[PDB]
Symmetry: D3
Subunit: 112 residues, 6 copies
């Protein structure tokens, strides 16, 4: 229940605006252990796997709601979000979407 | 709908406490383009016009509620607010108050 | 009603993780005057008394809810909290718990 | 000797990258009083007049050297500078260049 | 040689400007363990004892030079210093001044 | 001369202390484009390739000197360094060490 893991990815707009570090810091500060990371349509992305108790739903709270017009200040989208097109970041919706998203993006050796 | 514009002003207490930059940064980070700025009862103020989709209601969310005792951490008043007398900042209430507040404080050449 | 005072304490996990300064800064930025401070089971702690209008309930808002899985980003636990065991910080629950907690931890000369 | 004043300006590249607030904050934190501000070839700029003891030479130290390849971390160019073309910011070289730069960019009523 | 200890104190001007937390954070980030702390002419002060390898000379580097007109950006005085009157902070000059300053300001039980 | 590239790596102590994001942010803010990234004796590491004019010598300046007792505040080691054992970060010494370090740690497809 603390071996729990989610997929996170800095969308091209996050990368282009210089927000990769800021996003990582946010998770480091909550205590989540980073487990894997790669820097792969239009723009490069930063795919990450993070681990900790409740990381899946907590990190969704941390991101804020899909529509940054409504996203709470303190959240990533609440602090940095533009519009819904350029919403900076993706994080797995639930435990099933996490397991599938992780495996899609990584070889299993790549993950701790 | 993205040519939208609001009036913002750092009240004398914001200026006196050294919060002008912090306030601007907050808006720069959300992606709003600054459009005009001047530094004019008791204490100097910093009047600004900002532009972007939904800037009017988003920036109100960003400020927090009038009563910083109740203002959410992450918002300007939630992070920096003292009492309701010294509430740091003013931002236009709605699209009508914005158009009027902008024109009151600026010559039209002064605005982009 | 502005002579109001609360007890705050950085739990051993807050101290061990290097968060004392960050916690103080948060309160300094809201305008609360620090009134007393000492750095005393397992791990050292930082006990503080803070003063200002509504400091008791405001600082509880600032901390976030007991369960950092649910704690709002922008709050201390929302930004830094791990699990409910390691919840970083304690703050007096109400005006009675404040007066008792202050007196328990300080000699009265120690308080301003 | 504390009525001293300099001209500062965020070049178009500073504005485009969202660094106006960060730059102001830097000066607010040193204790300089902002005295005037306007937001006017290619890109908008932010012209400012700042006041305090030794503000002219101190702010040059704060900016760092013209060549950000050599600019010291902690300085504006040391933290944010790209190349010498895009060097973010301009500040008056000496007390004579300050008086001339201020008057060039402002009406005298505009300055405190 | 890592049991080394210095005295540090936030002068009244540091306290009045809300810089206690910022100062502590700086030391926490370098890895120094805080060992004791009290919050005692004109204005309250924050006296601290910090411990770590070379803490005495390192923390002097961290403060910057006595004359903030010349103090390096990145240092406390370089980032926050006003003039030499209001120079924010005091730190022991050398290992002898440290041992004496610590004992002057603390009972020995008060120190870890 | 702007296609220049260096190797950077957050040592296990940087990772364990939660400094990966902070380190990346530092480079994003200088304008360097991240080009590749993986998260691989004792402790996990974060290997990165960064690109920009003079990135090799600039990033060495940004890190500070090998001996954090002497490392300048504003630099990574100056702000976060412990002792020379735990010096947080590695960066290629020169253009030859960069080309070799990059190829050692990456497949060439992995690099942009
Ligand atoms: Cl999404
Ligand atoms: Cl209002
Ligand atoms: Cl509790
Ligand atoms: Cl220039
Ligand atoms: Cl002194
Ligand atoms: Cl090395």
């Amino acid at each position: 229940m603390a071996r729990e893991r989610t997929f996170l990815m800095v969308k091209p707009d996050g990368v282009q605006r210089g927000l990769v570090g800021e996003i990582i810091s946010r998770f480091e500060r909550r205590g989540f252990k980073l487990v894997a990371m790669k820097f792969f349509s239009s723009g490069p992305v930063c795919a990450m796997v993070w681990e900790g108790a409740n990381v899946v739903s907590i990190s969704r709270t941390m991101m804020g709601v899909t529509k940054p017009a409504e996203s709470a200040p303190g959240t990533i989208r609440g602090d940095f979000g533009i519009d819904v097109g350029r919403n900076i970041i993706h994080g797995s919706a639930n435990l099933d979407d996490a397991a599938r998203e992780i495996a899609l993006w990584f070889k299993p050796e790549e993950v701790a």
